[PDB]
Amino acid sequence: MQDAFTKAIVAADLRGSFLSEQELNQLTNLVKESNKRLDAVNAITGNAAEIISDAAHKLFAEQTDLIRPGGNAYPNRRMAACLRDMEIILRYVSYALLAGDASVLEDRCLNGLKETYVALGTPTRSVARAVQLMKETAIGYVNSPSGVTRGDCSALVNEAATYFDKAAASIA
Amino acid sequence: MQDAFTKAIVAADLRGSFLSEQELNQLTNLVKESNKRLDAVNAITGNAAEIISDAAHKLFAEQTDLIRPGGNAYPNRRMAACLRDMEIILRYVSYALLAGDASVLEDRCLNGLKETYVALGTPTRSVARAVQLMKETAIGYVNSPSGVTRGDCSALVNEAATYFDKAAASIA
Amino acid sequence: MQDAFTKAIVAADLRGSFLSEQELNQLTNLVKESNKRLDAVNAITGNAAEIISDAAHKLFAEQTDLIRPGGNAYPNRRMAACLRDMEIILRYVSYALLAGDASVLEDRCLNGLKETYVALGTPTRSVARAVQLMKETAIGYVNSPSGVTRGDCSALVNEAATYFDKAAASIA
Amino acid sequence: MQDAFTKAIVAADLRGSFLSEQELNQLTNLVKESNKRLDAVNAITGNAAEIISDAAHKLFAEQTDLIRPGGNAYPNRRMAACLRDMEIILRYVSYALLAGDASVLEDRCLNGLKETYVALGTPTRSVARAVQLMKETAIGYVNSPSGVTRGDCSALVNEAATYFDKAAASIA
Amino acid sequence: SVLTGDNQQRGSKLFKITIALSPTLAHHPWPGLDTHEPSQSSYSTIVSLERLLPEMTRIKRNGGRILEITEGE
Amino acid sequence: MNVLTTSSQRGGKLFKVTMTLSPALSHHPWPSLDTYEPSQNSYSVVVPLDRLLAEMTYIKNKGGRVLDISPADLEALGPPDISSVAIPLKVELWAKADVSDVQAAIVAAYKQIFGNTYVLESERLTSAESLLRNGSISVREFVRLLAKSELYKERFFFCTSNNRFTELNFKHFLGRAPYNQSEIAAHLDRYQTFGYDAEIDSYIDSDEYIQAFGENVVPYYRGFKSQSGQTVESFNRMFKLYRGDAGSDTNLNLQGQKRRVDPKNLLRSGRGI
Amino acid sequence: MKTVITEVIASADSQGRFLNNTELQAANGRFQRATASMEAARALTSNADSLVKGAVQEVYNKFPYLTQPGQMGYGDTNQAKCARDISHYLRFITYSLVAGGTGPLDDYIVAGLREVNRTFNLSPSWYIEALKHIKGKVGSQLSGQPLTEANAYIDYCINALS
Amino acid sequence: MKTVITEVIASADSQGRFLNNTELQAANGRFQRATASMEAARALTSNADSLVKGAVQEVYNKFPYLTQPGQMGYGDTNQAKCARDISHYLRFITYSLVAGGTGPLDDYIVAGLREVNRTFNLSPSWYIEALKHIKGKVGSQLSGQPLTEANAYIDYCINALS
Amino acid sequence: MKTVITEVIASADSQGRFLNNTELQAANGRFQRATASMEAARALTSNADSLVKGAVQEVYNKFPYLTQPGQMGYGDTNQAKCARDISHYLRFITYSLVAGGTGPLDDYIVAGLREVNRTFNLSPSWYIEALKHIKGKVGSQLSGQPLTEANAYIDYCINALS
């Protein structure tokens, strides 16, 4: 796998060099944010179930046909899959968020996701929609927690977004 | 897998509706023929060995070269395969005949068959031929049995034909 | 093709709705920046030749072997291609920059490029490197002009970067 | 596996003889009861869930310790197993009932069960108890249906009992 | 399982191993919590020395413990 | 790519041709050195039988080279039906199995372990079968014996590449297809030092084998349904590895043993080594 | 899809053998029963609606609080859904009668039942009542074997739900 | 042993599921058939002997040379065996009728048939004639479904032998 | 999709050349106009509904017979559709204002217009009136360049329809 640190290493390696002092200072700083970073993740995991539940409700209110006979979320068995998938995507996103790197997410999840979806007949656009619905709800929690020391999480929040979006894009 | 009943169901499902009365009457009628249907199958299974044996003899009388060195039914090993294949196809056909649906035959047997034959260098033409030879012999029995109550089996006979023919076509 | 405006439209269309007021305000803002946006583009196009020239020199100083017999930039014929390619990528990047959207770049230019390079035996790594070298030089101009009204172009500068990077990544 | 018919055969085989006319008459009459036999089975299967649910409640009301910390039905994980097991035993019993023979029950369920339970520290006594609790409830249904043709099921009822009891005994 | 003949084709010294069986080691292909077989809570197998180390390590990580080891002959 | 018509309006069997494009063959109408569109590095055309000879000569006389030719009828065929492999079925060999049950397992094992590939009466193994049904051997152990057997080696391992043999192995021993270039690399190294027996041992020994159909269950196809830690692309690779029912792994056919899964596709799922 | 006919084919197919007498006997069973089964389906199909209304209703009587505001039973959307759902159950049941196997039920209704229900917090209990109430009504329009068949399938779901 | 009843149990058992309507339908099929089957068995059982004599005999007519010295058909021991063997075939057939499946046949007769026959140089052909001759006689004592059943099983062997 | 920006890119791209001054000049034009365009869109978007009602209505006044039974204008379904359709036209127009090109209009509305209309026997005439009526209303809420822009696009459709 890969993550923020490992990545920087690898770059350095191809140049063939010891790490730039400048480059260390990226990592040094990255460390300092850890605590923030962690709490962010904690927030997602803590609310997981709900994030999904929520997103789903909204997804199905919008795209009524998915749940109608002939649609992709009907019948039960299919519905179940659709829920499962949502979760997975989320799970990965979280992972990435901790790592500080997209990698883990796309190669395991998005590299064949579109093709699978195609073969199944699952409508990629709707999937993407779901991913966003999730995104917004999730950020909601990340950004509004309780009993955490008040401060600015924006930086993390945006990176979170990006991950969600990479997902949306590659699926779509 | 699938068969006549299940099929009609599935159709109905996508419309999202209870089964049309018209549609029931297809199935109702289908039931009535059961007994005939069964005997047909019974006739094939009872004569299986022979059907094949016969067809083969005729196949090789026609296409002498298949059994000559350099041909596709030579040497023994190959011959064996060729026989077994014939049989299999038959087996499936029978299955279909009972189900009242091509599917089983198509999915298990016919799907990919052409390509296999191609890759091996087996001459698809001859295969098809064999299938027909079989067809005629088989009908022979279906249509002329002993100790059975006399009546009209045509309907079944034709459906049988079709199955054989789907086979012939997709192989060829 | 696509670009920032058209994109937003399309999204809106699938929802089936008039454009969100929020969404307008993205576009409204985008307009305001236009003048900046334009100058940015103008800067690249004006310096094009140079940007490349420069990047190349540096590329070849680093990876001496490319220009040695048996390397990928040798002989002349190949060298020529290598230069041409660099330029193209640049050309597209510019296009994107004006559009306010990656698409054009991805679809006409980046798509399939990796695999091509692979099949030929072109070292993708080096290509990517070149792209970066270009990036830095280009920004150089965008960011340091003369006779332009002084103000903050950062926003644009970063977007520029991203384009270059999408390129680097997909090639690599 | 084995069942009433097969069994009689096998016996006859070792004598080396055709079936005695007397013996046929066992089977002849066995057939006649079929319909009753079937309904009996149907009754169990139809009520399965309940039978268990019920038995359990009673089991735990009696042996309160099983569900207390340190007992064998605690914690959840264990409880789950205990329920699952009860069900299985039931499932088998039913099977036997249809077959008209204990064997299936003995061979694929009862044999070695005691020892397992012992090794784990499961109290065999309690298991047996559960089985009986089930028995009574089950008979309850077998014996008191609605919309079945009224008649005498006793014969079947008793055989049912026996199966339950073989279970109880071998576990205990 | 009493060996009828040397099970393994490839040849080394063989050792019979008797293990208490976790549900995981031999899960039945059944809905719900998988159950090892009642009839054998103590599978006994014959193993070649070379395979003996891998077999024991895999047995170890799964719940079940070696009841006894006996040389297969 | 998909072909929309099997035959030309004038009767004529269409044939899909795949080439590596060259600047001469198609070039942008642009100033500077001619470049083919990158996206069409591998171009495909459907040509009637009549123009096929001319088409191919021209391609080759330029720097083009032909990747493969295929009849349009085989092409533009449905992706195989997954009906039988969506739910495999599964076989359990109880203790105190009666004669028939043991037979069923045996058959099923030969089916999965060897592919559709037919096993003749002489090929079949009495000894191994003997052991099963008087106890002594697990279904798992029988499976090991089959993969040790020469029959297995002659079909799968002695004709094709070790690269091919690995995935061939994966599919037979585990329903899954291979995920990632690493798995292929690991197995290859195992084979070089430990040899053939150790490699075979490492699939049955692996916990993935144990977790599903661990003992006394004939292996079934896990791939084609969602598995833990499986790359999404693996699912697509399962469609390449498994072509229809009545499609086999056959040394016998022309150039019999080739790779179903392109090396590049494996690289996509994961790289690192 | 699991019906009598499909199964025997499957079993025959696994062993690799032609359909012999064993299997045909079984098939015959399915066909003779059909007459009763078919009858039952005609009866349910006709009274569908009325059965559904009655059921939905029942549920509310059984669980009054559902209809209170801020609950799930409350507000028409939910009621509509509730109706829809039960319709489905019924629909499938008919299917299964005709197909002569649980197949249709298993694949549409049962598979994934739990998780769906969990994630949306649908209480199995509700459905169950619906069914029971139905069963009771059906227990008038039908009789003899037709009835028996209807029950079997209805129950099959009760057990799956619980 | 494969009979209708055993199979459905087996299938149910594998999946780990209660016997539901699907299987019972099948069972119902068997046992309904039984009445005919049973009748057939009573008929064969009674005429056994006579059928056997007739068959053995036939074989010799069909293959005169067997009775010549130095052949297999020659000398009483062999004739005795020949009789015995056919008796067996018959015996099993009856069994199978009653059991309502091929089971009995498969396990006694069919499994290992080839190799036995190879090692002792019994020509399948012979047996076959025996059977055929039988089939012909049976085709008088029986009629309708009873007959049909008898045939099925008799044939089943012909096919296995050939 | 055809907007000013996309076109110049396209043209540049075809020739294989960098965007030079020529094209930027053009782009600049698009951006200057936008302010007016955007304004117009805000105005239409807000009054949408009211415009639509008015239009639909008008059409009926203009073509009374449509509302008679057995005609197209008759029965709510049709009226609903009629409304929907005009909404669409409007929607797209706004889009086009914002995108700064006919693009959106061309691809959604215009391409295939004829055949659709032929096959369903929608008379272009109708639509036209709708539009005209609209144009007239818009001719109050807007003024100066904003107005001018609105017209342009509205007309563009009239011409395409006719």
Ligand SMILES: *[C@H](C)[C@H]1/C(=C/c2[nH]c(/C=C3N=C(/C=C4\NC(=O)C(CC)=C4C)C(C)=C\3CCC(=O)O)c(CCC(=O)O)c2C)NC(=O)[C@@H]1C
């Ligand atoms: C839900 C938000 C939307 C949706 C999804 C959907 N997916 C399936 C089925 C599958 N999807 C996958 C994909 C994955 N496999 C993985 O390992 C991962 C994570 C790395 C994913 C995301 C697979 C393999 C399946 C098949 C599952 C199976 O075989 O049981 C369905 C059901 C379709 C089917 O027939 O299986 C659905 C509905 N589509 C929608 O309708 C939603 C908008």
Ligand SMILES: *[C@H](C)[C@H]1/C(=C/c2[nH]c(/C=C3N=C(/C=C4\NC(=O)C(CC)=C4C)C(C)=C\3CCC(=O)O)c(CCC(=O)O)c2C)NC(=O)[C@@H]1C
């Ligand atoms: C960000 C989304 C919101 C937020 C975060 C935030 N966290 C801290 C500080 C800490 N967070 C943790 C949390 C953890 N550290 C761990 O090791 C673990 C796992 C066991 C967790 C969950 C810790 C220990 C700290 C330090 C003490 C503290 O809680 O303050 C801050 C303070 C700044 C900083 O850490 O640099 C902030 C801002 N707070 C918000 O208001 C955001 C919406």
Ligand SMILES: *[C@H](C)[C@H]1/C(=C/c2[nH]c(/C=C3N=C(/C=C4\NC(=O)C(CC)=C4C)C(C)=C\3CCC(=O)O)c(CCC(=O)O)c2C)NC(=O)[C@@H]1C
């Ligand atoms: C048709 C190809 C030829 C033919 C068949 C035929 N059969 C019947 C009637 C019956 N045949 C059976 C046979 C079975 N029923 C079963 O359940 C099984 C498997 C266990 C078998 C083998 C039965 C029971 C009947 C009904 C009783 C009877 O024989 O009368 C008919 C009559 C039509 C009908 O039953 O509706 C016919 C025509 N006879 C021919 O002449 C065709 C060449």
Ligand SMILES: *[C@H](C)[C@H]1/C(=C/c2[nH]c(/C=C3N=C(/C=C4\NC(=O)C(CC)=C4C)C(C)=C\3CCC(=O)O)c(CCC(=O)O)c2C)NC(=O)[C@@H]1C
């Ligand atoms: C950004 C990288 C640098 C920067 C830019 C900057 N530009 C302006 C303003 C304008 N620049 C232009 C440029 C054009 N308008 C056109 O129509 C064309 C194509 C024919 C061009 C090339 C114009 C007209 C303006 C407006 C008037 C002016 O005198 O500039 C600004 C001012 C802010 C604004 O948006 O008006 C800025 C900041 N300045 C820097 O320092 C950056 C490095």
Ligand SMILES: *[C@H](C)[C@H]1/C(=C/c2[nH]c(/C=C3N=C(/C=C4\NC(=O)C(CC)=C4C)C(C)=C\3CCC(=O)O)c(CCC(=O)O)c2C)NC(=O)[C@@H]1C
């Ligand atoms: C419930 C009435 C009582 C009870 C049950 C209980 N059982 C276990 C564990 C097992 N029970 C079995 C039984 C079977 N497994 C099978 O495969 C079959 C059919 C062939 C049966 C009947 C088995 C094998 C196990 C062991 C593995 C498993 O987890 O299933 C437990 C848990 C034991 C533990 O300590 O882990 C329990 C609780 N025991 C009671 O306390 C109840 C009175």
Ligand SMILES: *[C@H](C)[C@H]1/C(=C/c2[nH]c(/C=C3N=C(/C=C4\NC(=O)C(CC)=C4C)C(C)=C\3CCC(=O)O)c(CCC(=O)O)c2C)NC(=O)[C@@H]1C
């Ligand atoms: C016995 C526990 C209780 C009881 C049973 C009972 N049943 C019948 C008669 C029949 N029962 C059936 C049922 C089936 N036949 C099948 O093929 C299947 C599976 C698809 C079933 C479940 C049938 C068809 C009959 C025949 C007549 C009928 O329509 O019921 C009787 C009457 C005696 C007989 O066997 O003919 C009885 C007594 N009823 C009781 O009173 C017991 C408490």
Ligand SMILES: *[C@H](C)[C@H]1/C(=C/c2[nH]c(/C=C3N=C(/C=C4\NC(=O)C(CC)=C4C)C(C)=C\3CCC(=O)O)c(CCC(=O)O)c2C)NC(=O)[C@@H]1C
């Ligand atoms: C230069 C930095 C590196 C490099 C480049 C290089 N490229 C080729 C050959 C080709 N490059 C392309 C690229 C494109 N074609 C397109 O149409 C587009 C934009 C739409 C791109 C970006 C293509 C297609 C070719 C192959 C065919 C052709 O000539 O057009 C070479 C020569 C490879 C050869 O052997 O012919 C080179 C050298 N490689 C390097 O050495 C640098 C690191």
Ligand SMILES: *[C@H](C)[C@H]1/C(=C/c2[nH]c(/C=C3N=C(/C=C4\NC(=O)C(CC)=C4C)C(C)=C\3CCC(=O)O)c(CCC(=O)O)c2C)NC(=O)[C@@H]1C
């Ligand atoms: C006989 C009519 C003709 C013939 C046949 C032939 N087939 C093969 C080899 C195979 N054929 C199949 C067939 C099937 N696979 C299936 O699973 C099914 C349906 C389920 C069928 C019908 C397969 C799997 C093989 C490949 C495996 C193997 O060959 O062992 C051959 C042998 C090819 C060879 O060169 O060895 C032959 C000869 N060929 C003829 O000559 C007849 C025209």
Ligand SMILES: *[C@H](C)[C@H]1/C(=C/c2[nH]c(/C=C3N=C(/C=C4\NC(=O)C(CC)=C4C)C(C)=C\3CCC(=O)O)c(CCC(=O)O)c2C)NC(=O)[C@@H]1C
């Ligand atoms: C009726 C007793 C109660 C009730 C039901 C209710 N259901 C939902 C939501 C769903 N119910 C189902 C059921 C099915 N849909 C299918 O396709 C199938 C298989 C064929 C079944 C059984 C499903 C899947 C959903 C979820 C998706 C959906 O939007 O329907 C709700 C809404 C829950 C929510 O909005 O999250 C309700 C309320 N309503 C009542 O009043 C009763 C308490």
Ligand SMILES: *[C@H](C)[C@H]1/C(=C/c2[nH]c(/C=C3N=C(/C=C4\NC(=O)C(CC)=C4C)C(C)=C\3CCC(=O)O)c(CCC(=O)O)c2C)NC(=O)[C@@H]1C
């Ligand atoms: C009758 C057509 C011919 C004939 C028969 C004959 N059989 C043997 C020897 C054997 N026959 C069998 C057959 C069976 N034994 C069984 O237990 C079963 C299954 C229930 C069968 C079908 C077997 C096993 C043998 C081997 C030894 C034995 O007799 O048990 C012989 C003796 C041949 C020899 O040299 O071994 C003969 C002659 N006799 C005739 O006259 C016909 C030609």
Ligand SMILES: *[C@H](C)[C@H]1/C(=C/c2[nH]c(/C=C3N=C(/C=C4\NC(=O)C(CC)=C4C)C(C)=C\3CCC(=O)O)c(CCC(=O)O)c2C)NC(=O)[C@@H]1C
């Ligand atoms: C309103 C002026 C009159 C009227 C209209 C009417 N329209 C239809 C049907 C369709 N109208 C359209 C138009 C569009 N659909 C699109 O997708 C687009 C572009 C995005 C447009 C402009 C279409 C395509 C249809 C056909 C599909 C459908 O009908 O749903 C009807 C229905 C006529 C019929 O079904 O035969 C009607 C009646 N009716 C009035 O009241 C006015 C006279």
